[PDB]
Homo-oligomer: 392 residues x 4
C-alpha cells in the first residue's frame, strides 16, 4: 500500500528534523534543512508539512533573514505541491517561557507570548494554514502553591479570546486546536487530558472556533484509552486535528512511530477514524505524525521512520476494513448487541410518566435472568485481533 | 481539634459498613446495622450520612420490609440530628449491570436502570437530600470493539435528561453530580476524569442542574493532580460535591483515609477549599469521606478510621490557615508573583491593535534579561512543607 | 493451528472456574465442576491442569469428603490423559490470612500457613506435580510502620527452608517457584518484581531448589518490560514456571487472555521462549494461562476465552518463526549489530593490562566518528511488526 | 536544626550545577565553577562532593588542562575540609554512548567505555573515594529485537569483573554500587529496579565488592515502595550508597528536593535509616542528594534548594525519633504485633516432624477466631502521621 494526497499524511518540520539532543545527552544528528525536509517528505507521500515559528526562522532572525527563509520555503512548497495545513508557535524553549507563555506569573511574558503568536498567525494565514495548534507545554507548575489555577484559566481564556478576535477581524478563517498533555516539561500541565481541554474551550467567547489537538502519547502517559477519548471528542464535534505517535504507558514522552507503542489501541483508533458513519471516515482532517526518530538513528533511520508512520496507518486501515466486512464479525457484533446501543432507551414520545407506568421496566423485570446471559465480548475481541494479525 | 456541624463532614453508609470482602478474600467483618451506623457517626462528629439504595434496603425487599427499614432509619436521624445531604443508586453490583446501567448494550437493562434511579430519587426527596450522585462504575468496556462510545454518550444523556425533567416536574430541587473514575471495575470507564465529566455535562438539556462529584483517589489512579483538577472544577462552578479519600498512584482503588495517600496534595487541597476568596471557603458543600477501613481491622479499627478522616482534615486546615497567615509566606508569595497572575494581561480597553503597537511587548522586549530572573518557587514550597510539618 | 500435548498448555482450575465476583459486584456465573473442567480443558488442547488446595476441596472439608473429591479428580485425569504439572496453596482468601500467611505479624498464623502448605505438598507429590508455586498475595502492608520487612524476609526464608527440607526428606523432588506481584490485594506486596524474587531465592539454604513464576500482568502493573525480565530470569536460570495473561499497564489486575493486553510484548516474549539457541526453545516448562474470562461472559464465553489463550500463543509463535527466517530481517539484524553483543568485549587472554595498553580503545579512539553512525533499530522494529501483522 | 559533618550530607557537582536545559528548552542558568560549588556546599553543611568525570573535566580536555583543573579542585577541598566519598563516570552524554557503554551492540564502544571508567577509578582513588557508582543510563532498548538481554548481561558482567580485578590489584579498596533505573533515557533500562540489580550483583566474580546505589525517584517511577525496597537491600546487606530525591509517581524523572515528592515514604525512609537496630542507624554511608534545582530558579533558588534537602532530612529525623519514643506509639506497635514477626515461627529445635505433630498448628487451630481479631494498623498509621505533622 502506497500513500495518496487523499490520505492526508502531514509531518511537523521538528519530527524528522529532531537532532536527538535529549534530557541526558547531546545531539546525535546534524540540523535538517527545511527545503530539504519539504523535498524528502514530498517524496515519501506526505501531502503537507507543519512547523513552529522557531523551527523555520531561528529565534531572533532579522527581517531580511526571516524574509529570505520564508521565500525559499514557499518555493519548495510550490515545487513539490505540499501544503501547510497547520502552524504553531514555540512558547516553550526560550528561558523567558520557563513558567509559561499565556499563564506565566510574569505579566510581561504573557504580553510577549501573545505578540509571538499573532505574528505566527499572520505567517500561517499567508501560507494558507487552516489550523493554529496551541500546545501550552510550560503552563502548569512543579509545586501547588506556585500557581493560582483559577487566575491561570482566566489568563489562558483572556489570551485566546483576543486571538479569535484578531483572526475574525482580519478574515483569516483559522480554527484553534488546544493540545492537552498531563506533564513534561512541567510537573503538571494545565488542561491535562482531552476532557479538560474540551471543557475549557466550552467557556471561551467564540467556542465554535475552538477544538482540540489530542496526541496518542499524551493520553497514554496517564494510562487513558486514546481511542475512547477520541470517540468522545468526535461526539462533541471538537476533533479539529490529531497528532499520531506511540507510547508505552506512563513514563517520559517517547514520541515513537504511530503503532509502535500500544498496537491494539492503534488498531481501534484507525477503525474509529476510517469506518465512520456512512462508509465514510468519521474524521476528515490531516493525519499528522508528531513523533521523533530514535536517538540511535542516522538520517537513513529518520527517512525510514517517516515511512514507517505511513506504513503503520495504511496497514491498520486495511485490517480495520477487513474486520468490518467479515460475516463472522457481523455475527459476533449482533451477539454482543453493539448496535442495540444506538436504539433510544425510550420509545418515541415516551417520558418519565410512561416509563413509570411500564411494569416490565421494573416491577415485573427479571434481572436475574437477564444478568445470566453472556455478551460474547471476548469472542468479538479475538476476531478483531485475528484480523489485525492477518490470521483471517 | 473538634468537629462541628459547620464542618459538614459526611460518611457513606457503605464506608464504615464495608465488610472487607475484596477481590481475593472473604469478608473479615460482620454487617453494620444502619441504625447503629447513624448513632456512631453522630457520635464521632459527622453532620450527615449518605447511602446507595441497596446499602439501606437489601436489593429485592418487599414494600413492607422496605417501608419498615425506612421508618427506623428515619427515627435514628431524628434522634441524632443527622441529615442526608446526598443519596446515590447502586447500578454496579447486580449481575444485570455487568455491561452498565444507563449504557448497557441491552436495551431492557437501560430501561430498568432508569426506573431504579427514579425510585431512589423519590426516597432522597423524602429524606431532604439535595444531591443525587451518579457513579457509572459499569459504564465502559474491557475491549474497544464492544462499546460504541458515541451511542453510549447519547444513551447516558438520554437517561440524565429524563431524570432532570422528573425532578423539576416533581419539584424535588435536586442537583446531579456525575462521579468520574478512569477504571475499576471496567477495563476503562466512560468519562474517565473530572475534565471529561465536565465536558459531557455541558451537553445536557439543563446543564445548570448538573456538576461533578470528583474523588481524590479516582484522579490519582491516572496520576493526575487532584488539587489542580478541583481548581478547574471550581473555575467552571461545577464542584457540586466531593469525595475525600487517599490513594498511592496508579494501582487498584485503595480508598484509604483522607490524607493517608498523597499527603502533600491533601494539604494543597484543604488550602484550596478553605482559604477561598475573602477568608471564606471556596467550597460550601459536604466534606464527604468515601473510603474503606482496611481489611485488617475490626470494628474498633473501623471507628478509629472514621475519626482519622475528620482528624486529618482538621489538622490540615489548621496548617493551611497558618501557612497563609505567615508574613514570611506572604513575602515569598510576592516574590514568586503568584498574585500577579490575577492582573489581566491586557490594559483596560486594550485590544490586538494597541498590543501590536506596543513595542515593549515585543520589538523592544528583553526576553534574555527576563528569562534569567528566578521565581523563588522552591523556597515558597519549602515554607509550605515546614508549615505542614509544624516546624513553623 | 492446533495445540498438541508437546505445546504444554496448562490452565488453573480457578481460571475457567472464576465465577466473576469482583471487588464491586456479585458472581455472574455458577460454580464449575472440577471433573467437567478436566474434560473441557482436555477437549480444547490443554496437556495439564493446576489448582489451589481450596479450589478442589472446599475449605473445611472432612477427611471423607476430601478423599472423595480427590479420587473423582484422579479418575477424570486418568480418563483424559491430563497431568498436574504444578500445585499451589491458597494463603490469601480466608480472613485469618488478612495480614499474610508466612509473614503474618501473628505467629500462630505463620505456623498454620506452613501446615496448610505441607498438606498440599503431599497431595501434589501424590498427583505427580513437579512444581510448588508460592504466591504471597497477603505478604506486605498498607502502612509502612506496620510491617518489619527485614523480619518478614527472615520468616519467609524460614518457612521456605523448611518446605525444601521436608520435600527432600520425603523424596518428593519438587522445585519451588516464588511468584512476585507488586500490589493487590495488599497496598504493597513483598518481592514486588521478578528481580526482587530472584535476589531473595539466592539467600535460601538450597537455592538450587528455588526459582520464580513470573506472570505477564504482574510486571506490567509496574509498567516494566515483561520480555526483558524473563530474559534476565533465563540468564539466571530461575525460570521454573510462567503465568501468561494480559494487562493494560498500571491499574487493577485484569487477567485478560494472553496477548489481549500488550500485543507487541506478547510477540517478543513468544519469540524469546521459542527461538531459543540451537533452534530450540529457551524454555521447556508449562505455558500456563493464569487469566480470567471477563465478567460479561457466560460459560460459552468461558470456553471461547480458554481457546483464545491457545490460539494467541500459536499465532504469535508462527509469526516469530517467520520473522527470524526472513532474509531481510537477517540483513537488518546484521546492520543493527545484534549478534556482535555476543562476542566478548575483550580478546581471549586480554585483561586490564592489555586493555590499558591499547591506544585504539581510548587515546586514539574517534568517539565522534563512531557516534555519528546509526543502528537501524527503527527499520528492524518495523520489520518485526509487519511480520506480526502478517504483512510480509 | 543544623547539619554537622556527622550527618554526612553530600551533593553531586551536577545537582547544584545543573544548568536547567531540559528536553524542551534551553538552559536558564549559567555554569557553576566547581571551586565555587565546593565553597558554597561547605558553607551549607555538606561533608562531601561527588562528580562524574565529565562534570569536572570537560570531555576531551588535554592533559595539561585536566591536571590544572584537578589541582585547583584539590586545593578547594583542602581549604574547605570537604571530602569526595564517591566518584562516577559519564557513559550517557556523548553520542558514542547512544546504545550504551558496557552493553553497546558495537564492540569498540564497549572497549572505550571500560577505559573511560578505569581512568576515573584512578582519579577517584587519588581523591580518596571509597565508592564507584555505576549508572547504566544508556544500557537498554526502545525495541525488543534490538537488544539481546542475555548477551547484554554477559557483557555487563564481563566489564564489572575487570573493574573489580584492577581495583583489587591496585589496592584501591573501592566498593562498586550499581544504580537501577527503569527507563529514561532508554525506553527500558537493563537492571530496572533495586531487586534486578541485587540479583545481578550476586552473579559477579567477587560479589562482596558489589552492592547498589538506589535512588528515591527511580523506584517511584515504577510506583514501587522505596522504603520497602531499601529494607530488602539492607536485609541482603547491599545498600552501599543511596541517592535521595523526590518524585510524583510514574512520569519523567523530576529530581525534586528530598521529601518534596512522596512525603509519607520520605518519613518512613528516614525512620528506617536512623532508627536502626541498637539505637543506631541501620545505614552509615553518605546521605547523597541527587536532585536538580527547578528550571524556574536562579542561583539564589539553587542554594535555597540545596539547603531544603538537608532541612527536609533533619525535620523528618526529629519527627521519626519522637515517634518511636512515644509510649502511645509503643503501645500501638505492641497491639499491632510488629515485633512478634521478629520471633522465629518455629520453636528452638522444632522441625517439620514436631510441627506436623502440633495439633494446635492445624487440627485444633481456630482459623475463624483468629481471623476476626483486628491488627490496629490504621490507628498506628494515624499516630505516625500525627508525629510527622507535629501534632503530637
Ligand atoms: O509534546 C510536544 C508537543 O506535542 C509539540 O510538538 C506540539 O504538538 C506543538 O508545539
Ligand atoms: O469507586 C466507588 C465509588 O466511589 C462509589 O462509592 C460512588 O461514589 C457511589 O456509587
Ligand atoms: O494474582 C493472583 C495470583 O496470580 C494467583 O492466581 C497465583 O498464581 C496462584 O496462587
Ligand atoms: O537519573 C540520572 C542518574 O541518577 C545519575 O545522576 C547517576 O546517579 C550518576 O551517573
Ligand atoms: Mg503534539
Ligand atoms: Mg466516590
Ligand atoms: Mg499467577
Ligand atoms: Mg542518581
Amino acid at each position: 500500500v502506497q500513500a495518496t494526497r487523499e490520505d492526508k499524511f502531514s509531518f511537523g518540520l521538528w519530527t524528522v528534523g529532531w537532532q536527538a539532543r535529549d534530557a541526558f545527552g547531546d545531539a546525535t544528528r546534524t540540523a535538517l534543512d527545511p527545503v530539504e525536509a519539504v523535498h524528502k517528505l514530498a517524496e515519501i507521500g506526505a501531502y503537507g508539512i507543519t512547523f513552529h515559528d522557531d523551527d523555520l526562522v531561528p529565534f531572533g532572525s532579522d527581517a531580511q533573514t526571516r524574509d529570505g527563509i520564508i521565500a525559499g520555503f514557499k518555493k519548495a512548497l510550490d515545487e513539490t505541491g505540499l501544503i501547510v495545513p497547520m502552524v504553531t508557535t514555540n512558547l516553550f524553549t526560550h528561558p523567558v517561557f520557563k513558567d509559561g507563555g499565556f499563564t506565566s506569573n510574569d505579566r510581561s511574558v504573557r504580553r510577549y507570548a501573545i505578540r509571538k503568536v499573532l505574528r505566527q498567525m499572520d505567517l500561517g494565514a499567508e501560507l494558507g494554514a487552516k489550523t493554529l495548534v496551541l500546545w501550552g507545554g510550560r503552563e502548569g507548575a512543579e509545586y501547588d502553591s506556585a500557581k493560582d489555577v483559577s487566575a491561570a484559566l482566566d489568563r489562558y481564556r483572556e489570551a485566546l479570546n483576543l486571538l479569535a478576535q484578531y483572526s475574525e477581524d482580519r478574515g483569516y478563517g483559522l480554527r484553534f486546536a488546544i493540545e492537552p498533555k498531563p506533564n513534561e516539561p512541567r510537573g503538571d500541565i494545565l488542561l491535562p487530558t482531552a476532557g479538560h481541554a474540551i471543557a475549557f474551550v466550552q467557556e471561551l467567547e467564540r467556542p465554535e472556533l475552538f477544538g482540540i489537538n489530542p496526541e496518542t502519547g499524551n493520553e497514554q502517559m496517564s494510562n487513558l484509552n486514546f481511542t475512547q477519548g477520541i470517540a468522545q471528542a468526535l461526539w462533541h464535534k471538537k476533533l479539529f486535528h490529531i497528532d499520531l505517535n506511540g507510547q508505552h504507558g506512563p513514563k517520559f514522552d517517547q514520541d515513537l512511530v504511530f503503532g509502535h507503542g500500544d498496537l491494539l489501541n492503534a488498531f481501534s483508533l484507525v477503525d474509529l477514524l476510517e469506518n465512520g458513519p456512512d462508509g465514510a471516515p468519521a474524521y476528515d482532517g490531516p493525519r499528522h505524525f508528531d513523533y521523533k526518530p530514535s536517538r540511535t538513528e542516522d538520517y537513513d533511520g529518520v527517512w525510514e521512520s517517516a515511512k514507517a508512520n505511513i506504513r503503520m496507518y495504511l496497514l491498520l486501515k486495511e485490517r480495520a476494513k477487513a474486520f468490518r466486512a467479515d460475516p463472522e464479525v457481523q455475527e459476533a457484533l449482533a451477539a454482543s448487541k453493539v448496535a442495540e446501543l444506538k436504539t433510544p432507551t425510550l420509545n418515541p414520545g415516551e417520558g418519565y410518566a410512561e416509563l413509570l407506568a411500564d411494569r416490565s421496566a421494573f416491577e415485573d423485570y427479571d434481572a436475574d435472568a437477564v444478568g445470566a446471559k453472556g455478551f460474547g465480548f471476548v469472542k468479538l475481541n479475538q476476531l478483531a485481533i485475528e484480523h489485525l494479525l492477518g490470521a483471517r
